[PDB]
């Protein structure tokens, strides 16, 4: 129904941010339904240029569940048609007592996350580093995911992490005795795990609420804006450095980090893949490594997609200073809880959150230099 999905745009060359509202073939988006097809195209482009191949659900996915006290263990097996299998067993921390009729809402927290989780929400601890190692460039192709698909599989570590989240949600769908409301699943992570959580929410449509925390470069920052920051003297993480530091991106991305204008996506399109579902990301201006201006401009550009879909308040951004990396400032708890309350707890909470302190160091944000499109009202 979307036709043949384009996965490359060989002639692309755009120093500003790619236009969310124009397909690779030059067709303009017009309807809300068009966004589903555009999202599928962005997925293919992101896989091709920076994330590697995200495998589909494998033929074998088995799950069993057991509970001791308030801790559940979800034992998952995943297997291919060639008989290869891997296994992993995330745990779930439950609120006590009788659950809601449809089960507990749940946040999948990469290695526990760094946000406070309200008392009526269960927490699943996902050991993403075991699914795909992330110590340094030395970690390439190591982790459970690669014991299934092969150490030379093109998936980045973050794409392998997404795959694991998808198997977790498969297992939850198969395991009603885990007492989870599978329509009310969120995801969160901080720092490198916040890069991971954004990827999970973008690519796995069953996630109702995505919460990336101080994800920086390769998260809710854009590659093109971070290149501008580093060229003008801010000591930011950028595309060139990040592919040498770790294995969060595919080896193919190495071919583009010096040629960012030729990449027909940026992370504003990655973030927009969450639409029309909900996301709020949190940033910290104390660390220029995180590329503060790039995150504000990137999420401002991503925001236009929700605006065009008539659901601006489903996308939040809050950027402040004055606290340590991955420490949670109580000043932002109301904004976090507004999104959890609305999108996971079914409350009538307002979620209009889009704020920065503009503390961007040696650069400023100038929307007209980066965002070239007007926002259409998709019909
Ligand atoms: O050593 C790296 C190579 O492994 C990488 O190879 C790319 C992998 O994905 C394919 O789609 C590309 O065609 C191929 O070039 O190139 C970069 C290099 O650093
Ligand atoms: C352009 O590409 C999109 C996405 O694949 C597709 O939905 C649309 O039909 C294409 N346009 C034409 C004229 O085929």
Numbering used by the authors: 80 to 458
Question: What is the paper's account of this structure, in its own sentences?
Answer:
A common type of LCC in hardwood is the ester-LCC formed between α-1,2-linked 4-O-methyl-d-glucuronoyl moieties of acetylated glucuronoxylan and γ-alcohols in lignin. WT CuGE has a modular architecture with a N-terminal carbohydrate-binding module 1 (CBM1) domain connected to the catalytic domain by a proline-rich linker region. The overall fold of the catalytic domain of CuGE features a large ten-stranded twisted β-sheet flanked by α-helical elements and a surface-exposed active site.
Structures of ligand-bound complexes showed that the ligands bind in the highly accessible and solvent exposed binding site of molecule B only. Thus, the oxyanion hole is created solely by R271 with both the backbone amide and guanidinium side chain nitrogen atoms forming close contacts with the O6 carbonyl of the 4-O-methyl-glucuronoyl moiety (3.2 and 2.8 Å, respectively), mimicking the interactions in a tetrahedral reaction intermediate. The strong binding in dΔS270A:Um4XX-OH is in accordance with the well-defined binding observed in the complexes of CuGE.
